[PDB]
Design a protein around this ligand. Sequence first.
Ligand code: EMC
Ligand code: EMC
Length: 152
Amino acid sequence: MEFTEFNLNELIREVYVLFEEKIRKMNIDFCFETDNEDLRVEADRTRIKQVLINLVQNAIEATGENGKIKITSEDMYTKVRVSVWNSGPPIPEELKEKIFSPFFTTKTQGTGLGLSICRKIIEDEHGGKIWTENRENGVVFIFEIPKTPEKR
Ligand code: EMC
Ligand code: EMC
């Protein structure tokens, strides 16, 4: 893996641009907010991009037509936190960790959830944490990564 310094918000916007047409076609209300425009991390940009694409794809599928997605990025002491929320039904308590298993596959609309690989990227490769919670009439997926491999 290749760690480089990059603006995390720039990467989030790059991923939004990938989905902009689909989001609009589906009439989804999307918003992105940050608490620090110059939020920079040292991480593997390609791999973090893969996690973002996977979470946004899942948010769109989950929220469906006329849905809502909100992304936030937050600058924490030795880490950053990215939260991707969608309006939709809550994840049942028994499935919260099972969705991250390489052998969760009770999921279609044509595609697997990809979350075991997201976990590998966030937790194994970057020493962070990724989890889900139910909130505000929807579901959030949150990841945190150390700002540098040295703050792991
Ligand atoms: C109402 C979706 Hg930022
Ligand atoms: C499908 C890579 Hg999180």
